[PDB]
């Protein structure tokens, strides 16, 4: 009944260590896919804002500055940065 998911990308040990860094020592099977999914959604959110800025500047390259302005709009993670 138990099954091992295939992937290319973010390994189980990395996700284990990310959870551990937050103090969580034991995670269920669904947490691995969930962590990958949450990571992807967060990145899409940031990149969507970043690209909105890039396009507003009439550029084809997303800059670190675009990413900063985007990150500031995503809540607590980068709250307070820059001033």
């Amino acid at each position: 009944k138990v099954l091992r998911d295939n992937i290319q990308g973010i390994t189980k040990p990395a996700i284990r260590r990310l959870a551990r860094r937050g103090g969580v020592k034991r995670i269920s099977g669904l947490i691995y896919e969930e962590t990958r999914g949450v990571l992807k959604v967060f990145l899409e959110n940031v990149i969507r804002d970043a690209v909105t800025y890039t396009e507003h500047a009439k550029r084809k390259t997303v800059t670190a500055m675009d990413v900063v302005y985007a990150l500031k709009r995503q809540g607590r993670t980068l709250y307070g940065f820059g001033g």
Binding site: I10, R26, I31, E34, V46, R48, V67, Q74, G75
Partner: protein, 98 residues
């Protein structure tokens, strides 16, 4: 009080950021490939400054870790428990955001 080394040619604020970069947990090649995977869905002609990929990774790992910190802080049992999706969700409702 431990003695502190302050290089004459490079500011410690630069050193600290490089050090943090070495502390990241997601392998950098898969991370940059995940960014590629997302960018492909927006626009095939988007380029990214390398530094933008770095900022993304530093922030994304902080975001994930904070999800786990919040779950951790809401989990109070005498015997340790395995964390499930519902625990993440609940903790996010209790002390998380939005």
């Amino acid at each position: 009080k431990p003695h502190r080394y302050r290089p004459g040619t490079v500011a410690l604020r630069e050193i600290r950021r490089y050090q943090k970069s070495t502390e990241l947990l997601i392998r950098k090649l898969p991370f940059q490939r995940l960014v590629r995977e997302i960018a492909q869905d927006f626009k095939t002609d988007l380029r990214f400054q390398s530094a933008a990929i770095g900022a993304l990774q530093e922030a994304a790992e902080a975001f994930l870790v904070a999800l786990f910190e919040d779950t951790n802080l809401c989990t109070i049992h005498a015997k340790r428990v395995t964390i499930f999706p519902k625990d993440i969700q609940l903790a996010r409702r209790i002390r998380g955001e939005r």
